[PDB]
């Protein structure tokens, strides 16, 4: 997962 | 008026991400470590003043500085992000710094532990005497 | 050692030749002057040991050495020739020198005097510290 | 004119  | 000079140095940007067997209290699932160093065990301190690691807003105190080796941040979290890295030189001129956008990426559980390495060559055309000396002791 | 350095210097090679009014006793018809220098009066002495101008075999004592600026030779003769120029650096290693084949041409009578300039760039990759310093005081 |  990645955080905008 | 006859001598022009150019200097490349290499940096390494890199990161290690790894799943925790037990998540934290806040629901951080991975431990990671981002860093900046030189290749072949170079001492980049000679021309680096400081490194700043701009962590995502979701961290408290997001802007993390290292003035001295090691230039690294160790943290826990639950997702990767674009992680700007400013390297500031011991330089009274341009360039005073340089900014990279680093892909601090995680692998889900079941997948291997991340270990990434990004190279950057930098170029400095006709620095001052002072900084070229600093550049070339490293 | 990650840091790499490339130093460039500019040399100039050039010459003047003009028709004498009265030929000499050997039937020399032209007076000429060949030389080597840096541009905008740059101190090339810092990194030049010596320059050797190889005149044609027709000349007595053909191998002419200048250890000190001005690096030049003034002579009379009757025709142009290829004129090897060896420039020797104050360098413990390669390159210790460099060779150019300089077209020392005259003009016929009735034509203007020669005034020729040949600009030349030298590149050095990762010289020693010592040579880098002399190169760049130039 | 050129000398060989």
């Amino acid at each position: 997962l990645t955080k905008p | 008026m006859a001598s022009s000079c150019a200097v490349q140095v290499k940096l390494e940007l890199g990161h290690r991400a790894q799943v925790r067997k037990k998540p934290t209290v806040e629901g951080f699932t991975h431990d990671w470590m981002v860093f900046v160093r030189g290749p072949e065990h170079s001492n980049i301190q000679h021309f680096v003043e400081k490194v700043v690691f701009h962590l995502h807003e979701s961290f408290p105190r997001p802007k993390r500085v290292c003035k001295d080796p090691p230039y690294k941040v160790e943290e826990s979290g639950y997702a990767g992000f674009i992680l700007p890295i400013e390297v500031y030189f011991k330089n009274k001129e341009e360039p005073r710094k340089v900014r990279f956008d680093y892909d601090l990426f995680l692998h889900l559980e079941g997948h291997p532990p991340v270990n990434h390495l990004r190279c950057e060559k930098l170029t400095f055309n006709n620095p001052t005497e002072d900084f070229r000396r600093k550049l070339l002791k490293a």
Side-chain angles (χ1 to χ4, degrees), chain B residues 20-40 42-46:
Chain B
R20 316 171 37 84
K21 205 204 301 226
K22 189 147 203 192
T24 73
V25 177
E26 308 87 2
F28 307 154
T29 54
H30 295 80
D31 295 347
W32 57 254
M33 199 265 248
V34 67
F35 53 84
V36 161
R37 69 203 181 180
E40 274 190 329
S42 310
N43 208 333
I44 65 160
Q45 159 145 67
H46 292 298

PDB file of all heavy atoms in Angstrom, chain B residues 20-46, unseen atoms left out:
ATOM      1  N   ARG B  20       6.539  -6.560  10.415  1.00  0.00           N
ATOM      2  CA  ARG B  20       6.676  -6.901  11.848  1.00  0.00           C
ATOM      3  C   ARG B  20       5.866  -8.176  12.093  1.00  0.00           C
ATOM      4  O   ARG B  20       4.790  -8.307  11.496  1.00  0.00           O
ATOM      5  CB  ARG B  20       6.147  -5.753  12.704  1.00  0.00           C
ATOM      6  CG  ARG B  20       6.563  -4.364  12.251  1.00  0.00           C
ATOM      7  CD  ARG B  20       5.796  -3.315  13.030  1.00  0.00           C
ATOM      8  NE  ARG B  20       5.587  -3.711  14.414  1.00  0.00           N
ATOM      9  CZ  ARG B  20       6.469  -3.547  15.393  1.00  0.00           C
ATOM     10  NH1 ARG B  20       7.644  -2.998  15.149  1.00  0.00           N
ATOM     11  NH2 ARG B  20       6.171  -3.935  16.620  1.00  0.00           N
ATOM     12  N   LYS B  21       6.365  -9.084  12.928  1.00  0.00           N
ATOM     13  CA  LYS B  21       5.564 -10.280  13.278  1.00  0.00           C
ATOM     14  C   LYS B  21       4.375  -9.812  14.111  1.00  0.00           C
ATOM     15  O   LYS B  21       3.315 -10.450  14.039  1.00  0.00           O
ATOM     16  CB  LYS B  21       6.397 -11.297  14.056  1.00  0.00           C
ATOM     17  CG  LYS B  21       5.926 -12.739  13.954  1.00  0.00           C
ATOM     18  CD  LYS B  21       6.367 -13.569  15.132  1.00  0.00           C
ATOM     19  CE  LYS B  21       7.870 -13.609  15.290  1.00  0.00           C
ATOM     20  NZ  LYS B  21       8.348 -14.989  15.540  1.00  0.00           N
ATOM     21  N   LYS B  22       4.558  -8.743  14.873  1.00  0.00           N
ATOM     22  CA  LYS B  22       3.458  -8.202  15.647  1.00  0.00           C
ATOM     23  C   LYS B  22       3.272  -6.743  15.252  1.00  0.00           C
ATOM     24  O   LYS B  22       4.184  -5.953  15.428  1.00  0.00           O
ATOM     25  CB  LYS B  22       3.768  -8.361  17.141  1.00  0.00           C
ATOM     26  CG  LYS B  22       2.610  -8.028  18.074  1.00  0.00           C
ATOM     27  CD  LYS B  22       2.563  -8.846  19.358  1.00  0.00           C
ATOM     28  CE  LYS B  22       1.169  -8.884  19.952  1.00  0.00           C
ATOM     29  NZ  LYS B  22       1.169  -9.431  21.325  1.00  0.00           N
ATOM     30  N   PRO B  23       2.128  -6.333  14.658  1.00  0.00           N
ATOM     31  CA  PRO B  23       1.868  -4.914  14.396  1.00  0.00           C
ATOM     32  C   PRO B  23       1.947  -4.064  15.660  1.00  0.00           C
ATOM     33  O   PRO B  23       1.836  -4.600  16.760  1.00  0.00           O
ATOM     34  CB  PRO B  23       0.448  -4.915  13.821  1.00  0.00           C
ATOM     35  CG  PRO B  23       0.308  -6.274  13.173  1.00  0.00           C
ATOM     36  CD  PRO B  23       1.074  -7.199  14.102  1.00  0.00           C
ATOM     37  N   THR B  24       2.171  -2.751  15.512  1.00  0.00           N
ATOM     38  CA  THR B  24       2.216  -1.874  16.679  1.00  0.00           C
ATOM     39  C   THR B  24       0.794  -1.581  17.162  1.00  0.00           C
ATOM     40  O   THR B  24      -0.190  -2.160  16.694  1.00  0.00           O
ATOM     41  CB  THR B  24       2.933  -0.536  16.432  1.00  0.00           C
ATOM     42  OG1 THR B  24       2.061   0.251  15.621  1.00  0.00           O
ATOM     43  CG2 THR B  24       4.307  -0.661  15.813  1.00  0.00           C
ATOM     44  N   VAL B  25       0.719  -0.636  18.102  1.00  0.00           N
ATOM     45  CA  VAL B  25      -0.524  -0.186  18.691  1.00  0.00           C
ATOM     46  C   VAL B  25      -1.297   0.667  17.679  1.00  0.00           C
ATOM     47  O   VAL B  25      -2.520   0.564  17.599  1.00  0.00           O
ATOM     48  CB  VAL B  25      -0.207   0.544  20.013  1.00  0.00           C
ATOM     49  CG1 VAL B  25      -1.431   1.137  20.695  1.00  0.00           C
ATOM     50  CG2 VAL B  25       0.521  -0.389  20.971  1.00  0.00           C
ATOM     51  N   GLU B  26      -0.598   1.493  16.889  1.00  0.00           N
ATOM     52  CA  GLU B  26      -1.281   2.402  15.987  1.00  0.00           C
ATOM     53  C   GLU B  26      -1.670   1.666  14.713  1.00  0.00           C
ATOM     54  O   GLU B  26      -2.268   2.271  13.844  1.00  0.00           O
ATOM     55  CB  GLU B  26      -0.429   3.606  15.591  1.00  0.00           C
ATOM     56  CG  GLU B  26       0.173   4.370  16.752  1.00  0.00           C
ATOM     57  CD  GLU B  26       1.512   3.831  17.231  1.00  0.00           C
ATOM     58  OE1 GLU B  26       2.041   2.850  16.624  1.00  0.00           O
ATOM     59  OE2 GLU B  26       2.027   4.386  18.217  1.00  0.00           O
ATOM     60  N   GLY B  27      -1.329   0.375  14.588  1.00  0.00           N
ATOM     61  CA  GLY B  27      -1.621  -0.366  13.370  1.00  0.00           C
ATOM     62  C   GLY B  27      -0.550  -0.153  12.295  1.00  0.00           C
ATOM     63  O   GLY B  27      -0.860  -0.156  11.101  1.00  0.00           O
ATOM     64  N   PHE B  28       0.703   0.068  12.744  1.00  0.00           N
ATOM     65  CA  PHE B  28       1.869  -0.037  11.889  1.00  0.00           C
ATOM     66  C   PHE B  28       2.260  -1.516  11.800  1.00  0.00           C
ATOM     67  O   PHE B  28       2.469  -2.195  12.802  1.00  0.00           O
ATOM     68  CB  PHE B  28       3.018   0.828  12.408  1.00  0.00           C
ATOM     69  CG  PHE B  28       2.705   2.279  12.681  1.00  0.00           C
ATOM     70  CD1 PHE B  28       3.449   2.996  13.607  1.00  0.00           C
ATOM     71  CD2 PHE B  28       1.662   2.923  12.038  1.00  0.00           C
ATOM     72  CE1 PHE B  28       3.160   4.324  13.877  1.00  0.00           C
ATOM     73  CE2 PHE B  28       1.376   4.261  12.289  1.00  0.00           C
ATOM     74  CZ  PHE B  28       2.120   4.955  13.220  1.00  0.00           C
ATOM     75  N   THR B  29       2.400  -1.974  10.553  1.00  0.00           N
ATOM     76  CA  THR B  29       2.571  -3.360  10.161  1.00  0.00           C
ATOM     77  C   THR B  29       4.016  -3.654   9.739  1.00  0.00           C
ATOM     78  O   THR B  29       4.424  -4.804   9.893  1.00  0.00           O
ATOM     79  CB  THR B  29       1.562  -3.695   9.044  1.00  0.00           C
ATOM     80  OG1 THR B  29       1.674  -2.780   7.967  1.00  0.00           O
ATOM     81  CG2 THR B  29       0.110  -3.590   9.464  1.00  0.00           C
ATOM     82  N   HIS B  30       4.754  -2.645   9.202  1.00  0.00           N
ATOM     83  CA  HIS B  30       6.148  -2.782   8.755  1.00  0.00           C
ATOM     84  C   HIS B  30       7.127  -1.855   9.498  1.00  0.00           C
ATOM     85  O   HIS B  30       6.755  -0.781   9.975  1.00  0.00           O
ATOM     86  CB  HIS B  30       6.284  -2.421   7.273  1.00  0.00           C
ATOM     87  CG  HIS B  30       5.574  -3.328   6.329  1.00  0.00           C
ATOM     88  ND1 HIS B  30       4.225  -3.235   6.095  1.00  0.00           N
ATOM     89  CD2 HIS B  30       6.014  -4.339   5.549  1.00  0.00           C
ATOM     90  CE1 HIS B  30       3.866  -4.175   5.221  1.00  0.00           C
ATOM     91  NE2 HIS B  30       4.933  -4.870   4.887  1.00  0.00           N
ATOM     92  N   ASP B  31       8.404  -2.274   9.587  1.00  0.00           N
ATOM     93  CA  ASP B  31       9.515  -1.418   9.997  1.00  0.00           C
ATOM     94  C   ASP B  31      10.366  -1.096   8.780  1.00  0.00           C
ATOM     95  O   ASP B  31      10.657  -1.997   8.012  1.00  0.00           O
ATOM     96  CB  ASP B  31      10.413  -2.100  11.022  1.00  0.00           C
ATOM     97  CG  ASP B  31       9.688  -2.371  12.324  1.00  0.00           C
ATOM     98  OD1 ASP B  31       8.594  -1.797  12.476  1.00  0.00           O
ATOM     99  OD2 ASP B  31      10.230  -3.135  13.186  1.00  0.00           O
ATOM    100  N   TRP B  32      10.720   0.189   8.576  1.00  0.00           N
ATOM    101  CA  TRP B  32      11.601   0.540   7.473  1.00  0.00           C
ATOM    102  C   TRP B  32      12.654   1.576   7.847  1.00  0.00           C
ATOM    103  O   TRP B  32      12.572   2.251   8.872  1.00  0.00           O
ATOM    104  CB  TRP B  32      10.844   1.014   6.231  1.00  0.00           C
ATOM    105  CG  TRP B  32       9.951   2.182   6.476  1.00  0.00           C
ATOM    106  CD1 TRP B  32       8.595   2.116   6.548  1.00  0.00           C
ATOM    107  CD2 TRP B  32      10.297   3.559   6.686  1.00  0.00           C
ATOM    108  NE1 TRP B  32       8.073   3.352   6.811  1.00  0.00           N
ATOM    109  CE2 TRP B  32       9.075   4.260   6.875  1.00  0.00           C
ATOM    110  CE3 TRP B  32      11.493   4.284   6.731  1.00  0.00           C
ATOM    111  CZ2 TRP B  32       9.003   5.646   7.062  1.00  0.00           C
ATOM    112  CZ3 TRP B  32      11.424   5.651   6.948  1.00  0.00           C
ATOM    113  CH2 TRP B  32      10.203   6.320   7.079  1.00  0.00           C
ATOM    114  N   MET B  33      13.608   1.676   6.921  1.00  0.00           N
ATOM    115  CA  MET B  33      14.809   2.445   7.089  1.00  0.00           C
ATOM    116  C   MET B  33      15.164   2.962   5.704  1.00  0.00           C
ATOM    117  O   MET B  33      15.374   2.157   4.785  1.00  0.00           O
ATOM    118  CB  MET B  33      15.905   1.532   7.634  1.00  0.00           C
ATOM    119  CG  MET B  33      17.050   2.238   8.278  1.00  0.00           C
ATOM    120  SD  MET B  33      18.397   2.489   7.163  1.00  0.00           S
ATOM    121  CE  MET B  33      19.606   1.384   7.900  1.00  0.00           C
ATOM    122  N   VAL B  34      15.101   4.300   5.554  1.00  0.00           N
ATOM    123  CA  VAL B  34      15.522   4.963   4.333  1.00  0.00           C
ATOM    124  C   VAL B  34      16.893   5.587   4.630  1.00  0.00           C
ATOM    125  O   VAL B  34      17.197   5.875   5.774  1.00  0.00           O
ATOM    126  CB  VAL B  34      14.451   6.002   3.912  1.00  0.00           C
ATOM    127  CG1 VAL B  34      14.392   7.140   4.902  1.00  0.00           C
ATOM    128  CG2 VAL B  34      14.667   6.612   2.560  1.00  0.00           C
ATOM    129  N   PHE B  35      17.718   5.840   3.611  1.00  0.00           N
ATOM    130  CA  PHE B  35      19.045   6.390   3.831  1.00  0.00           C
ATOM    131  C   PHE B  35      19.629   6.984   2.573  1.00  0.00           C
ATOM    132  O   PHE B  35      19.133   6.779   1.471  1.00  0.00           O
ATOM    133  CB  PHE B  35      20.060   5.335   4.272  1.00  0.00           C
ATOM    134  CG  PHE B  35      20.118   4.136   3.350  1.00  0.00           C
ATOM    135  CD1 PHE B  35      20.884   4.141   2.182  1.00  0.00           C
ATOM    136  CD2 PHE B  35      19.374   3.004   3.638  1.00  0.00           C
ATOM    137  CE1 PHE B  35      20.979   3.002   1.383  1.00  0.00           C
ATOM    138  CE2 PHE B  35      19.408   1.893   2.793  1.00  0.00           C
ATOM    139  CZ  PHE B  35      20.213   1.893   1.678  1.00  0.00           C
ATOM    140  N   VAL B  36      20.700   7.736   2.821  1.00  0.00           N
ATOM    141  CA  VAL B  36      21.550   8.329   1.816  1.00  0.00           C
ATOM    142  C   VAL B  36      22.990   8.133   2.279  1.00  0.00           C
ATOM    143  O   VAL B  36      23.339   8.511   3.417  1.00  0.00           O
ATOM    144  CB  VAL B  36      21.222   9.826   1.689  1.00  0.00           C
ATOM    145  CG1 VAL B  36      22.337  10.635   1.018  1.00  0.00           C
ATOM    146  CG2 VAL B  36      19.899  10.033   0.967  1.00  0.00           C
ATOM    147  N   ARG B  37      23.833   7.699   1.334  1.00  0.00           N
ATOM    148  CA  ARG B  37      25.245   7.440   1.594  1.00  0.00           C
ATOM    149  C   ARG B  37      25.945   7.494   0.246  1.00  0.00           C
ATOM    150  O   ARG B  37      25.281   7.611  -0.804  1.00  0.00           O
ATOM    151  CB  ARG B  37      25.439   6.077   2.295  1.00  0.00           C
ATOM    152  CG  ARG B  37      25.118   4.902   1.383  1.00  0.00           C
ATOM    153  CD  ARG B  37      24.730   3.566   1.986  1.00  0.00           C
ATOM    154  NE  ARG B  37      24.481   2.566   0.940  1.00  0.00           N
ATOM    155  CZ  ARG B  37      24.128   1.301   1.181  1.00  0.00           C
ATOM    156  NH1 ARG B  37      23.891   0.889   2.422  1.00  0.00           N
ATOM    157  NH2 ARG B  37      24.011   0.448   0.175  1.00  0.00           N
ATOM    158  N   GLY B  38      27.265   7.353   0.259  1.00  0.00           N
ATOM    159  CA  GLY B  38      28.003   7.286  -1.013  1.00  0.00           C
ATOM    160  C   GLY B  38      28.298   5.847  -1.375  1.00  0.00           C
ATOM    161  O   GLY B  38      28.211   4.985  -0.483  1.00  0.00           O
ATOM    162  N   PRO B  39      28.639   5.536  -2.638  1.00  0.00           N
ATOM    163  CA  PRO B  39      29.020   4.177  -3.013  1.00  0.00           C
ATOM    164  C   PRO B  39      30.387   3.770  -2.452  1.00  0.00           C
ATOM    165  O   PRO B  39      31.015   4.580  -1.804  1.00  0.00           O
ATOM    166  CB  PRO B  39      29.124   4.270  -4.531  1.00  0.00           C
ATOM    167  CG  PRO B  39      29.499   5.700  -4.768  1.00  0.00           C
ATOM    168  CD  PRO B  39      28.676   6.465  -3.759  1.00  0.00           C
ATOM    169  N   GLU B  40      30.797   2.525  -2.685  1.00  0.00           N
ATOM    170  CA  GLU B  40      32.147   2.068  -2.265  1.00  0.00           C
ATOM    171  C   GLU B  40      32.564   2.703  -0.938  1.00  0.00           C
ATOM    172  O   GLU B  40      33.752   3.081  -0.826  1.00  0.00           O
ATOM    173  CB  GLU B  40      33.177   2.467  -3.319  1.00  0.00           C
ATOM    174  CG  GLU B  40      33.309   1.467  -4.455  1.00  0.00           C
ATOM    175  CD  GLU B  40      34.487   1.715  -5.384  1.00  0.00           C
ATOM    176  OE1 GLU B  40      34.867   2.893  -5.556  1.00  0.00           O
ATOM    177  OE2 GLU B  40      35.022   0.732  -5.936  1.00  0.00           O
ATOM    178  N   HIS B  41      31.645   2.815   0.025  1.00  0.00           N
ATOM    179  CA  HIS B  41      31.964   3.406   1.320  1.00  0.00           C
ATOM    180  C   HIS B  41      32.744   4.719   1.158  1.00  0.00           C
ATOM    181  O   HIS B  41      33.858   4.862   1.677  1.00  0.00           O
ATOM    182  CB  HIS B  41      32.667   2.367   2.204  1.00  0.00           C
ATOM    183  N   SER B  42      32.122   5.673   0.437  1.00  0.00           N
ATOM    184  CA  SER B  42      32.572   7.059   0.341  1.00  0.00           C
ATOM    185  C   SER B  42      32.114   7.834   1.568  1.00  0.00           C
ATOM    186  O   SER B  42      31.003   7.608   2.020  1.00  0.00           O
ATOM    187  CB  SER B  42      32.008   7.728  -0.888  1.00  0.00           C
ATOM    188  OG  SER B  42      32.220   6.940  -2.031  1.00  0.00           O
ATOM    189  N   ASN B  43      32.921   8.788   2.043  1.00  0.00           N
ATOM    190  CA  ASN B  43      32.487   9.683   3.096  1.00  0.00           C
ATOM    191  C   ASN B  43      31.896  10.978   2.495  1.00  0.00           C
ATOM    192  O   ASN B  43      32.566  12.014   2.387  1.00  0.00           O
ATOM    193  CB  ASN B  43      33.616   9.898   4.106  1.00  0.00           C
ATOM    194  CG  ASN B  43      33.105  10.212   5.507  1.00  0.00           C
ATOM    195  OD1 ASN B  43      32.011  10.758   5.707  1.00  0.00           O
ATOM    196  ND2 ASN B  43      33.910   9.896   6.506  1.00  0.00           N
ATOM    197  N   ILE B  44      30.587  10.948   2.201  1.00  0.00           N
ATOM    198  CA  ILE B  44      29.907  12.067   1.572  1.00  0.00           C
ATOM    199  C   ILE B  44      29.810  13.268   2.535  1.00  0.00           C
ATOM    200  O   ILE B  44      29.509  14.375   2.100  1.00  0.00           O
ATOM    201  CB  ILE B  44      28.511  11.661   1.028  1.00  0.00           C
ATOM    202  CG1 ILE B  44      27.511  11.257   2.132  1.00  0.00           C
ATOM    203  CG2 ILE B  44      28.617  10.588  -0.052  1.00  0.00           C
ATOM    204  CD1 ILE B  44      26.057  11.320   1.690  1.00  0.00           C
ATOM    205  N   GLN B  45      30.135  13.045   3.836  1.00  0.00           N
ATOM    206  CA  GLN B  45      30.089  14.158   4.821  1.00  0.00           C
ATOM    207  C   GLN B  45      30.962  15.336   4.353  1.00  0.00           C
ATOM    208  O   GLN B  45      30.566  16.475   4.589  1.00  0.00           O
ATOM    209  CB  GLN B  45      30.481  13.665   6.215  1.00  0.00           C
ATOM    210  CG  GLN B  45      30.959  14.757   7.156  1.00  0.00           C
ATOM    211  CD  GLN B  45      30.534  14.504   8.581  1.00  0.00           C
ATOM    212  OE1 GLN B  45      30.978  13.556   9.222  1.00  0.00           O
ATOM    213  NE2 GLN B  45      29.663  15.360   9.088  1.00  0.00           N
ATOM    214  N   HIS B  46      32.048  15.087   3.665  1.00  0.00           N
ATOM    215  CA  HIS B  46      32.911  16.163   3.207  1.00  0.00           C
ATOM    216  C   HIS B  46      32.155  17.253   2.417  1.00  0.00           C
ATOM    217  O   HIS B  46      32.500  18.437   2.546  1.00  0.00           O
ATOM    218  CB  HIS B  46      34.111  15.598   2.447  1.00  0.00           C
ATOM    219  CG  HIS B  46      35.022  14.842   3.337  1.00  0.00           C
ATOM    220  ND1 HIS B  46      35.680  15.440   4.394  1.00  0.00           N
ATOM    221  CD2 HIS B  46      35.354  13.549   3.369  1.00  0.00           C
ATOM    222  CE1 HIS B  46      36.396  14.527   5.029  1.00  0.00           C
ATOM    223  NE2 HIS B  46      36.203  13.374   4.428  1.00  0.00           N
TER     224      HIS B  46
END
